[PDB]
Amino acid sequence: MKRTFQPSVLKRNRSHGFRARMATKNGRQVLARRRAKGRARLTVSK
Amino acid sequence: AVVKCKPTSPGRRHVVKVVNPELHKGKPFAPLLEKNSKSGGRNNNGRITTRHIGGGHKQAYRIVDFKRNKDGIPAVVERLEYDPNRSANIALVLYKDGERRYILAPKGLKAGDQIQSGVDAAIKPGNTLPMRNIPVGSTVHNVEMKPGKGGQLARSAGTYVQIVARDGAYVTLRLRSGEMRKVEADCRATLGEVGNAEHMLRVLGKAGAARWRGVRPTVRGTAMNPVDHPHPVTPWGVQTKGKKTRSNKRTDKFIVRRRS
RNA sequence: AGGACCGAACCGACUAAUGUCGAAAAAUUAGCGGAUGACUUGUGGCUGGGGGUGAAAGGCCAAUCAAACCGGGAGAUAGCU
RNA sequence: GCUCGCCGGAAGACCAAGGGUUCCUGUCCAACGUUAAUCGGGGCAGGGUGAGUCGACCCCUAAGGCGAGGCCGAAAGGCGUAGUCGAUGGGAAACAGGUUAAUAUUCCUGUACUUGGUGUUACUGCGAAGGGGGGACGGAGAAGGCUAUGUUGGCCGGGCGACGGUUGUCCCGGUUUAAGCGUGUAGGCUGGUUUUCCAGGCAAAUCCGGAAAAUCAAGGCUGAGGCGUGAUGACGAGGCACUACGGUGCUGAAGCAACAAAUGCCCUGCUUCCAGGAAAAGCCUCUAAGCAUCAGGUAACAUCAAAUCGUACCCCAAACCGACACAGGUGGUCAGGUAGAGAAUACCAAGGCGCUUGAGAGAACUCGGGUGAAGGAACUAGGCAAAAUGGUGCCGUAACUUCGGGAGAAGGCACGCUGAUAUGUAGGUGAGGUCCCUCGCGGAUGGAGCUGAAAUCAGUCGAAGAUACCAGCUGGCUGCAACUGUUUAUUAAAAACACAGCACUGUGCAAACACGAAAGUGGACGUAUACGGUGUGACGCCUGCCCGGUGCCGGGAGGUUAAU
RNA sequence: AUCGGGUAAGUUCCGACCUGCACGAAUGGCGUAAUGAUGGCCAGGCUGUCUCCACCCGAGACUCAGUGAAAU
RNA sequence: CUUUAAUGUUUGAUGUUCUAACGUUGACCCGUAAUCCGGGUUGCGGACAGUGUCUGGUGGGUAGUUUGAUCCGGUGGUUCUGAAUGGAAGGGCCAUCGCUCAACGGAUAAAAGGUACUC
């Protein structure tokens, strides 16, 4: 069978990238929470 | 013409085709074409507002002129073409000045026929004339409710309306639905009845015809679970099967008689 | 010409066997139905939770669905173990 | 190193996506490899990815996203115009050989090509977010020309050979050469030249479109392949001299003809079908504003530049997704020889592997198979599973039927090899010579040569000649459903769901209906032959009675009836 | 969804009647060619399904060497 | 004052007509290389439609639940008190009355079923 996760860099970036998140305020709030938690990997990117 | 296919197999046993030998067997007129992206029943919100719509073969929109603003310009019918968007065949019309357009083809129209729009037009089929000039008791198609609107009544194949009464600046039209409507005299209309009146004879044969014509399968209410469907009422709870949904109170002044 | 016929790739799993702390959190062998379409597939998007989609099984919604997951009310309440 | 076995429409070679150095060398077995390991996709060090011609990048755009003003909404925010993004598409260009342990269409050798800037020369009107053409398109199907490719023959170099014969009609290997350039053919499309005029192409126009005429009947566009140059160059079997014995250098003969032939090109071609089959940009052309002693454009020459990013490695797998070095899944391209209708099947070439535990013995029992005395379903919920037929050609094929089907019904006979018909037939292809030629890739005769079924007779060996793999069991009765098809991913594939048809009902178009606090959308750039809902489910007979209760429609006689 | 056929033997199946608990005419009734990985029955062949199992070929099972879990 | 009538007044229900509010998903022009939107002209309806508050009816479509006691008080008498003073309303004191609210120590004034999809 084919598992749920089929990697695709373009789709991953466009669905969870910084620009995609910040296009809306909710993603900006998520980024703010991530920064407050101090995660080194703020988002998914190369 | 109407033909019945031999029962060489199921799916052709009951097929009845409507063949029009004089239709153009070639590419359409590119300048008047326009792309028509299918919607699949979705709206701006992307949800299915109307069901049973989807799939189908790609079809390019034909820019069919209905207002017929070319007044006093005689034109010749070059040929007839099939319009997937309309149930009736279209006609290519070339004017004297050297401009081509698409018009609704009435029953008595063929290649090489002469047409003329505007108030100064004859009574031959295909001409456009206001109901004030048109004699009472005549058959017209592609009628307008407002001057310059373009035409909204009797646009399908073999569809026509009857001019019954002339009350001053208004005219009474009996429609194919048995409805009497009052329309302003300044509006435009086309004489004759739309062509390809044999549209009923087609039966589509099998599921695939409807599937690729742009209709998806319909699921009966009984087969649906109580959560999905109320099961006579509509899926949204409205009592169908003999309940009037006409609530306008704005155009009722133009309503003379309701269907019977 | 054929939602035609037999049958490869492809799609799915109708039967039997093995596999249930297995090679696999539904797998493998031979048979099996379609195989020019109402077929399938690569890519990119749209439809987001009392909602989406559904040729409609209460089916699917990231191995979880008669109401997903994540954080909060919340140390909800439990005459019960 | 030599044997034995497997894949070979792959278990081979390229890639796309996905990984991020796993790629090569040196060095070690601390931990990993389900055992050992000197080995490795393990540990440490070094090296490795060269682009105007590949792709990304960049111009345009579909689905779709954002969205200046604007509409709407308590706020957040939702819709959307102009615009901007968005390849899954359209746009300019390279081929052959050689080389490292790792790069090559990037490096070297040879021959080229494409886009712009600058300068010279000779001419000339240029000039757009604007107009016109093209770009620019569906399904199915047949033929012809070809080609990649393979077979044979001639030619070249070698061999005559350890178990009988093999200088002979014998055996082994090669017999390759691109892009570009010129000729432009098979084929396909279209009638051209000139003049005059027109409220059409949201202004104009020499451009398109339309209307008139005079003239010829040919011209114009597209177009695979082949032919010469590219190329007396590279490559090339084999031999020769040294080997850190892995390997390096020199040399180098022939490099042709016929046949067959593709899913690949002519072919976005041609013939038919209704389901009527993207858009924009580059590209050619016309002018508006503005300038026309300029600027700008055309044609030839010389020169400059074409930047930046990835270029290793795996890519049906040990490297990607499955927690694994996992019997699972993963898109495209090339894909040969014999038999075979076939990309099936049996064995092989090229190329790649023997799948990371084995050595003994051959107990019961388990897993997958082979055989079997006699019966042949007597075992079993149930012919579950097993067993059996299975192909080509010829004869023949019932009941019913919507006349198509049932049907490959059922049921009967020949299939091997050799000679003759025929020192290989029919058929296909087809040289040289001869004759014409509107003179070359032109047309007739001719059959050289090559390829080559099918059928009859006769003979012949075997128990069996569709001798292997591949390869329907058959008929009758009968309920269901018209049929094809889809469904509970991961126990239920069905009588269930769906379906073309049928009937009712609603909707007059700012239509009904649905998403929406509203805007605005789908319906529909459709409109009563149209769309939504309901019920049944082809076709024939049909669909009988009932309006009391609940809905729906219409009514207003008379009573009740809130806000006010 | 009682009588006869099929077997020597038939609560299944087929055909005939209706004593239709509780079929019935578009939540449709009656037949229907063809179709079905659809439910059931019968007949011809076939055979290890069985009378009744017997032997053989490969991997386990057993012994040795190296590594080396589990539920409880 | 009972009974009538021309005249000027408050006016409303209804009918015909008109445009100036209002709609125009009708047409033309501009912002604008613009199917959005706004503005200028005109035609079409027009005090209709539509919207805002209140209100009658329908409304498993949706949402929360179920499967003489009590509160309320009817009347009385009692100046006990009565929220600045004085009254009144509302409470308190004595009597009586309205429910087999009988599930009769009565949990709400107001509540029926299925789950084999279940937890």
Curated annotation (Swiss-Prot), chain A:
Q: For this chain's UniProt record, which GO biological process terms are given?
A: cytoplasmic translation
UniProt keyword terms in alphabetical order: Ribonucleoprotein, Ribosomal protein
HAMAP family, alphabetized: Ribosomal_bL34
Oligomeric state and partners?
Part of the 50S ribosomal subunit.
Family note: Belongs to the bacterial ribosomal protein bL34 family.
* Keyword Ribosomal protein set for record: yes
Question: Where does the signal sequence lie?
Answer: none
What is the organism field in this record? Escherichia coli (strain K12)
Q: Which GO terms describe its cellular component?
A: cytoplasm; cytosolic large ribosomal subunit
Molecular-function GO terms, alphabetical? structural constituent of ribosome
Return the NCBIfam families for the record.
rpmH_bact (TIGR01030)
Q: InterPro entries of this UniProt entry?
A: Ribosomal_bL34, Ribosomal_bL34_CS
Please state what the protein is called: Large ribosomal subunit protein bL34
Swiss-Prot record, chain B:
A cellular-component GO term for this protein: cytosol
Q: Which InterPro entries match?
A: NA-bd_OB-fold, Rib_uL2_dom2, Ribosomal_uL2, Ribosomal_uL2_bac/org-type, Ribosomal_uL2_C, Ribosomal_uL2_CS, Ribosomal_uL2_dom3, Ribosomal_uL2_RNA-bd_dom
Q: What is the effect of changing residue 229 to Q?
A: Loss of peptidyltransferase activity in reconstituted ribosomes. No change in rRNA binding or assembly into ribosomes
Q: Report the transmembrane regions from the record.
A: none
Q: Record's superkingdom?
A: Bacteria
Q: Where is this region: Disordered?
A: 27-52, 220-260
Q: Which family does it belong to?
A: Belongs to the universal ribosomal protein uL2 family.
Summarize the subunit comment.
Part of the 50S ribosomal subunit. Forms a bridge to the 30S subunit in the 70S ribosome, contacting the 16S rRNA. Interacts weakly with S6 in one of the 3.5 A resolved structures. In pull-down experiments interacts with CedA.
Quote the function comment for this protein.
One of the primary rRNA binding proteins. Located near the base of the L1 stalk, it is probably also mobile. Required for association of the 30S and 50S subunits to form the 70S ribosome, for tRNA binding and peptide bond formation. It has been suggested to have peptidyltransferase activity; this is highly controversial.
Protein name listed in UniProt: Large ribosomal subunit protein uL2
